[PDB]
Write an enzyme that holds these catalytic residues in place. Structure first.
Site, short mmCIF file in Angstrom:
data_model
loop_
_atom_site.label_atom_id
_atom_site.label_comp_id
_atom_site.label_asym_id
_atom_site.label_seq_id
_atom_site.Cartn_x
_atom_site.Cartn_y
_atom_site.Cartn_z
N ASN A 168 0.74 -0.94 0.11
CA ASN A 168 -0.17 0.05 -0.04
C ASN A 168 0.89 1.16 0.18
O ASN A 168 1.48 1.63 0.98
CB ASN A 168 -1.08 -0.06 1.00
CG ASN A 168 -2.03 1.02 1.31
OD1 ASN A 168 -2.20 2.04 0.30
ND2 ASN A 168 -2.51 1.28 2.32
N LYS A 179 -0.26 4.27 -0.30
CA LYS A 179 -0.95 5.21 0.25
C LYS A 179 -0.73 6.61 -0.66
O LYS A 179 -0.96 6.29 -1.83
CB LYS A 179 -0.55 5.63 1.95
CG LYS A 179 -0.54 4.08 2.48
CD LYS A 179 -0.39 4.57 4.15
CE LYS A 179 -0.48 3.11 4.90
NZ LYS A 179 -0.34 3.66 6.23
N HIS A 210 -9.73 1.12 4.95
CA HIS A 210 -8.26 1.28 5.59
C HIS A 210 -8.65 2.25 6.86
O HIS A 210 -9.55 3.24 6.65
CB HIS A 210 -7.28 1.88 4.72
CG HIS A 210 -6.25 1.98 5.22
ND1 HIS A 210 -5.58 2.87 5.99
CD2 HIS A 210 -4.95 0.99 5.25
CE1 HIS A 210 -4.28 2.62 6.59
NE2 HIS A 210 -4.01 1.52 6.10
N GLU A 229 -7.00 4.58 7.99
CA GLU A 229 -7.00 6.07 7.79
C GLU A 229 -8.36 6.78 6.96
O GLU A 229 -8.75 7.79 7.67
CB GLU A 229 -5.91 6.50 6.82
CG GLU A 229 -4.45 6.21 7.39
CD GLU A 229 -3.23 5.55 6.57
OE1 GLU A 229 -3.35 5.55 5.47
OE2 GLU A 229 -2.23 5.19 7.19
N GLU A 247 -5.33 -4.60 10.74
CA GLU A 247 -4.37 -4.01 10.91
C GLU A 247 -4.51 -3.23 12.17
O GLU A 247 -5.29 -2.06 12.29
CB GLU A 247 -4.41 -2.78 9.70
CG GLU A 247 -5.50 -1.94 9.54
CD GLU A 247 -5.33 -0.99 8.41
OE1 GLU A 247 -4.13 -0.33 8.26
OE2 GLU A 247 -6.46 -0.49 7.85
N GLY A 260 2.54 3.28 11.41
CA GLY A 260 3.37 4.32 11.21
C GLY A 260 4.14 4.72 12.71
O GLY A 260 4.57 5.95 12.72
N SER A 285 3.47 -2.07 10.46
CA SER A 285 5.07 -1.98 10.93
C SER A 285 5.63 -3.32 10.34
O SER A 285 6.33 -4.25 11.48
CB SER A 285 5.34 -1.69 12.21
OG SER A 285 4.90 -0.46 12.47
#
Lengths: 249, 249
Positions: free
Chosen positions: A10, A12, A94, A96, A166, A172, A212
């Site tokens: 991904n 992103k 996702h 995000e 996830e 991150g 990660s």
């Protein structure tokens, strides 16, 4: 026996024409001596170049999001438009989008059923936040997430679906889950699936770990029984992604 | 006198490679004799095709939305990514983004200010809804929307901004907007600019009409003092757009 893994990159909201072209060269160069499906999720803008330059027999391209239908949705991209474009893999829900773009469980469920209806292979993301986990509420959250999705699919639909687990805390921050935290989350998911949908379904199901993943930790992660592959963030913009893919042996 | 007009085609979440290829050719054959800037705002997915195929010296390409920075923003597209791909026009703050996608005045303001910084030409969209109009808050809403934007900019930055007035109260509601009403909102926006920013800037400023425009009422709409062109929705997908461009002469 383990289902066919996936190594999903991904990208992103990142990249330039030059940096990406570089990366793509590298992958096409790679000899993949095992049955693994590798997916490259580029920005919408980068799809054309990606689809033009990606040559590897083991790679497919994917989108990072979409809305269900075409229409008066300025700034967005729909499933029909992706499909006329020749994209058949998609990443949906996702964290995000969930965190920032107001996507609720319902919204993700709707998007996933839609995509599934148009014939795409979907990687559906689920996972808990620091908060939830610290509160000893991981099971409820994860289960509630998968249940929402499941609610709209037909047993038949399951063939098109890929689960990505996830851990929000794991994104991150450098903080990867331990192979024991991942295996336990993954086994929890599959158990819902077998009891709720069928063992048969439970058994064919790809559950990807995200958070990660790097060159270093992926081999051990992969080793876990309920781990079938990876959804990679920052290390997918690196040569290390090659290392990740190999870990899926 | 009026500054250079703009004829902006907002394709929204629409299009197939075929149908757009077909529309681009028509555009390409178009004879435009006067000084008008034409803008084609495709989905991010169609940018490459559009860019390659559109050859008419009077047309530029635009994006329909962006986020300020590259980063861990799955599904989103950033300014640097658009800059690298050679797009230097963008539509920000569309009514639809404001309504379903959580774009406040402050977010829109941030987006504008970052695009400007990056040297993009920006079509910034403002407008009040049916309830705000009816409730007599047209001035307040509109003037708050422009002010939010103005605060982050320098006077010199104005050279890079285009205002689009969308009478949101007339879109999908069943209400009809008249040239006169359009004019009244445009006059109000200019007055504020004139006053707060300056007359020089105000005089140069392009204010586009973002309401319902067809070949049929374009000319009439353009007749109005403070109307500098259009931001077109549905009609932009049609041959009829060429009649709208002509209407700016």
């Amino acid at each position: 026996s383990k289902p066919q893994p996936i190594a999903a990159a991904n990208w992103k909201c990142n990249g330039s024409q030059q940096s990406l072209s570089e990366l793509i060269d590298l992958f096409n160069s790679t000899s993949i001596n095992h049955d693994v499906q590798c997916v490259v999720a580029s920005t919408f803008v980068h799809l054309a170049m990606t689809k033009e330059r990606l040559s590897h027999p083991k790679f497919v391209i994917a989108a990072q999001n979409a809305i269900a239908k075409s229409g008066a949705f300025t700034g967005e991209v729909s499933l029909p438009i992706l499909k006329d474009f020749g994209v058949n893999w998609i990443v949906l829900g996702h964290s995000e989008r969930r965190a920032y773009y107001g996507e609720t469980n319902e919204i993700v469920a709707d998007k996933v059923a839609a995509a599934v209806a148009s014939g795409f292979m979907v990687i559906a993301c689920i996972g808990e936040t620091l908060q939830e986990r610290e509160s000893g509420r991981t099971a409820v959250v994860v289960l509630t997430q998968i249940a929402a999705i499941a609610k709209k699919l037909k047993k038949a639909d399951w063939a098109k679906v890929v689960i990505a687990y996830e851990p929000v805390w794991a994104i991150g921050t450098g903080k990867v889950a331990t192979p024991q935290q991942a295996q336990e989350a993954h086994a929890l998911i599959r158990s819902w699936v077998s009891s709720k949908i069928g063992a048969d379904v439970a058994g064919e199901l790809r559950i990807l770990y995200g958070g990660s993943v790097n060159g270093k930790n992926a081999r051990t992660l992969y080793q876990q029984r309920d781990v079938n592959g990876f959804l990679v963030g920052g290390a997918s913009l690196k040569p290390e992604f090659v290392d990740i893919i190999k870990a899926t042996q």
